[PDB]
Amino acid sequence: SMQRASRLKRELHMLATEPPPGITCWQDKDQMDDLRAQILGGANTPYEKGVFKLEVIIPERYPFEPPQIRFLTPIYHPNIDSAGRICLDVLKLPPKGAWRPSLNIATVLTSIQLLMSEPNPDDPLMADISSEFKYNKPAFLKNARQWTEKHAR
């Protein structure tokens, strides 16, 4: 669709020139809908000094369906599973999700970055991590740091 293509050209331009701090996103090859992204570990989070790569797939009905985003870099987090799937409202269609066409790739990567700093034990994908985050925060932080040094550094 020409609508989809013109929208992706503008998004790639904005990702190339005014990416959110800590976030970068680019074409894997020459397809505007097969993208990769990277989020730096935030300071004063246990992911600090880690670099996290993500796969960003833009579905055929974008911008009416959300980007399909998974971590490629392993990450220890209540809302991210061992395959890198992300439990985050803006990645899902309504009524339950929050995706709308006025969000975009940069918005949702920023939301994923914010989720990394502020987990949601409301909506766990990882029950054991969520309980550890909630009830034994120092163990959570040590495990999350150790997973970062092991897989993201």
Ligand SMILES: Nc1nc2cc(F)ccc2o1
């Ligand atoms: N895989 C998965 N993603 C989710 C996003 C939500 F907002 C709620 C439940 C979810 O489950």
